[PDB]
Amino acid sequence: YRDAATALEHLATYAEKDGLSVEQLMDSKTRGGLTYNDFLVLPGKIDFPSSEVVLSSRLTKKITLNAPFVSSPMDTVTEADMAIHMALLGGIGIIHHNCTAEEQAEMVRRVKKYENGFINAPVVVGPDATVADVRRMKNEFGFAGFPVTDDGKPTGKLQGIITSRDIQFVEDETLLVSEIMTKDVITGKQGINLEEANQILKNTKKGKLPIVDGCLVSMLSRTDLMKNQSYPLASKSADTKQLLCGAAIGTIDADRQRLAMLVEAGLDVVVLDSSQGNSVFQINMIKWIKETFPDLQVIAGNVVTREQAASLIHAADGLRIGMMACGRPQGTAVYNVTQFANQFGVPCIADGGVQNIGHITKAIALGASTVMMGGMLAGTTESPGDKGSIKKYIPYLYNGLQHSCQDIGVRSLVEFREKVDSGSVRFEFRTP
Amino acid sequence: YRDAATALEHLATYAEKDGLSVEQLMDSKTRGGLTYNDFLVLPGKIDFPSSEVVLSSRLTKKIT
Amino acid sequence: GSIKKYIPYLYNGLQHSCQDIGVRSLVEFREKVDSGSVRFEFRTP
Amino acid sequence: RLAMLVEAGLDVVVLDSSQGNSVFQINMIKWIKETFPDLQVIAGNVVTREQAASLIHAADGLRIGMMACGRPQGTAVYNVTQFANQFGVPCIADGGVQNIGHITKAIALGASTVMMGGM
Amino acid sequence: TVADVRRMKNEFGFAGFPVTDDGKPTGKLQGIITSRDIQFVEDETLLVSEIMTKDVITGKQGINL
Ligand SMILES: Nc1nc2c(ncn2[C@@H]2O[C@H](COP(=O)(O)OP(=O)(O)OP(=O)(O)OP(=O)(O)OP(=O)(O)OC[C@H]3O[C@@H](n4cnc5c(N)ncnc54)[C@H](O)[C@@H]3O)[C@@H](O)[C@H]2O)c(=O)[nH]1
Ligand SMILES: Nc1nc2c(ncn2[C@@H]2O[C@H](COP(=O)(O)OP(=O)(O)OP(=O)(O)OP(=O)(O)OP(=O)(O)OC[C@H]3O[C@@H](n4cnc5c(N)ncnc54)[C@H](O)[C@@H]3O)[C@@H](O)[C@H]2O)c(=O)[nH]1
Ligand SMILES: Nc1nc2c(ncn2[C@@H]2O[C@H](COP(=O)(O)OP(=O)(O)O)[C@@H](O)[C@H]2O)c(=O)[nH]1
């Protein structure tokens, strides 16, 4: 028999590495169209803990996410609650367009204002406002920390602040806010930095830090600091410290106005929702959105072929992949589209057919940047209307992906993409 | 990364179009006998409404 | 149900499938498929 | 834990890992050989040729068998066993064995012994 | 230590702990420490006395509920 010390040396003797390369596995001529279940990714070398794995994924060319998890823009999956929690857990949610423009615009607004660094146009109450009116406002707005202004206007002179603790055990509901409102409120001078303002609030050990000019400009909340502390992988705007929000719109002329209202609500990413996205209408819309709203990131699709991706890219911040009579197997569609699309630096979303961690790992291995979940997320508490809360569930998927990455021998999604493309990562076709 | 304006130009770089031709798909020697459920037709370019589609079919040489 | 409702449904459905494919007529579809313009993918079980 | 087991007259030690191609298991194999030389060490689980080479370079025997990450057992046993058999390292075919036919097929593919746990 | 108070909160489930000189429930009251006090404390090695509220509002014994 051969010596044990010659194993690595003898290993080089073989013409090719054990298993199949991505190019060999994804052969339309020999193996045909494939799905996630049709193949497996072979294990490599484990020299790092699963903890060290980085799951940062690029949703668009200008947008990067901590976890590559995207909520589908479906009536039964993504709403204001689902979008907020998905962003909070290092993922983003696309709001469903199966509603009026006003209704959809409000949902984007709610997600944008759930967490803030500097509160803009903060809700304020009049000095003559009744205690009952403040209680009526809390259920309506969902928050009870309202500063008091002389004219009842957001930019009015600041006369004090009223909170939940102030009216919590008030026997008389007919009393004015002025009598029940805190007389002296700790505030920060206008022009102060967010870090400097946060320091003043931390020392003060108070719930709110209104910012004045002595008129009211913006307000800081202790709660936001707690939200940031509790969720450190949350997907939010670095400049505003607000959760990133995505919405789904049509390719019709009527959606041009609907998009305007959504953009006005602070919408960060727009996804063009089409079964077949390779149309003149969607191509014309992409150009219109770029000219009309340049700062907005546009995700174009759905595209299942290389030609479709080229056309949408020539117009597209990101690409949505996934499509009875007309369509393509998801595994084959992701690799072919992603192979061409990846060259131009366009991140691609693998949409549909994702029910487990294995599907997520396989989809990314095939060249996908992020994966869209719509059947899995459905039945969660955060979903409109049982798999439990996404708070517990999203952390589970994130941990699972790290372990699968460790078994493969890749410390990051970026390394995984490079190793698979380099042929280092090996695959095996699975028989029925 | 490659420029976005070079996508269509770069598209011609590939030896053959994405997907299989009818001749390639209908191979008795390699894929064997096939049925309707066994294959799918890939989407192309949509520059017309569905309304404009004409479904006129020839039942016989003299009947349409 | 009645074929009056059902036949119109099949006719509309065929038009949509033709639109997704990128062919404006059955004649064009036949020519494009024969020309190799139309592409197909084998489906695994 | 191994020291106490060795003290009890333990003959063969199997390193229990879903993926056995790690620095920790590689370091453990060397530690066990230096600390308890008489003990026979079975390393794994390995489903690929590269994994087997790494564990062999460290392994008295190899344990073969591994959703998102894994390999079909028939393909894994032949590929691992083909390389491993050259160095005189007996390989155990672990998992998927429910009948005599599986046992016969596993050995035919180059496996030395078969592991039974559901049966 | 501030860390000990944090360790106590998970163990007891509440963080509103008054401070006594001898550390006994019936000891002289020197102040009270709560969740808001240690919520954003960068240094975990600090004593409770420095981070504990200096003046605490209390009720005389024999007072009705
Ligand atoms: N509020 C608000 N939030 C928005 C808005 N838009 C978005 N949001 C978001 O919604 C979230 C608000 O959540 P929250 O602040 O936890 O809920 P809330 O209902 O606003 O809090 P409250 O119950 O009012 O606090 P509570 O009165 O219980 O303690 P505290 O304020 O310390 O009270 C303790 C005592 O100290 C006094 N006090 C409080 N602050 C004071 C100050 N600066 N100076 C002097 N005194 C002060 C008070 O009067 C009170 O009696 C934030 O994440 C925020 O970003 C908006 O328009 N308004
Ligand atoms: N605590 C406790 N609970 C038990 C025990 N056994 C059973 N329980 C039960 O457990 C429950 C306790 O729940 P809880 O009180 O809501 O939770 P907790 O962790 O104790 O509250 P905390 O977060 O400490 O309040 P927090 O500090 O956020 O606000 P506050 O105390 O106003 O802080 C605001 C600021 O004001 C200062 N402050 C607070 N009180 C002060 C006072 N009297 N005088 C002067 N200053 C005061 C504080 O230092 C803080 O900075 C109660 O139902 C209680 O009956 C026990 O042994 N201990
Ligand atoms: N008011 C407020 N401040 C925030 C928020 N998120 C972060 N900060 C500030 O940012 C600092 C911590 O930065 P870090 O958490 O690393 O930034 P992140 O990566 O955006 O979460 C703290 O000093 C906070 O004052 C927020 O949602 N609201």
mmCIF file of C-alpha atoms in Angstrom, chain B residues 21-42:
data_model
loop_
_atom_site.group_PDB
_atom_site.id
_atom_site.type_symbol
_atom_site.label_atom_id
_atom_site.label_comp_id
_atom_site.label_asym_id
_atom_site.label_seq_id
_atom_site.Cartn_x
_atom_site.Cartn_y
_atom_site.Cartn_z
ATOM 1 C CA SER B 21 -33.327 24.884 -30.387
ATOM 2 C CA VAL B 22 -36.257 22.581 -31.416
ATOM 3 C CA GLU B 23 -33.752 20.274 -33.266
ATOM 4 C CA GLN B 24 -31.507 20.068 -30.118
ATOM 5 C CA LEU B 25 -34.475 19.425 -27.712
ATOM 6 C CA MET B 26 -36.124 16.707 -29.916
ATOM 7 C CA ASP B 27 -33.161 14.226 -29.838
ATOM 8 C CA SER B 28 -34.326 10.522 -29.748
ATOM 9 C CA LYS B 29 -30.693 9.283 -29.231
ATOM 10 C CA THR B 30 -29.837 11.511 -26.178
ATOM 11 C CA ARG B 31 -33.114 12.657 -24.441
ATOM 12 C CA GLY B 32 -35.351 9.832 -25.837
ATOM 13 C CA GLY B 33 -39.094 10.157 -26.616
ATOM 14 C CA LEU B 34 -40.585 13.349 -25.068
ATOM 15 C CA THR B 35 -44.097 14.600 -24.071
ATOM 16 C CA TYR B 36 -45.553 18.172 -23.655
ATOM 17 C CA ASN B 37 -44.868 18.140 -19.841
ATOM 18 C CA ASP B 38 -41.177 17.107 -20.434
ATOM 19 C CA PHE B 39 -40.166 20.563 -21.877
ATOM 20 C CA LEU B 40 -40.908 24.345 -21.700
ATOM 21 C CA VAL B 41 -40.571 27.178 -24.312
ATOM 22 C CA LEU B 42 -38.394 30.142 -23.096
#
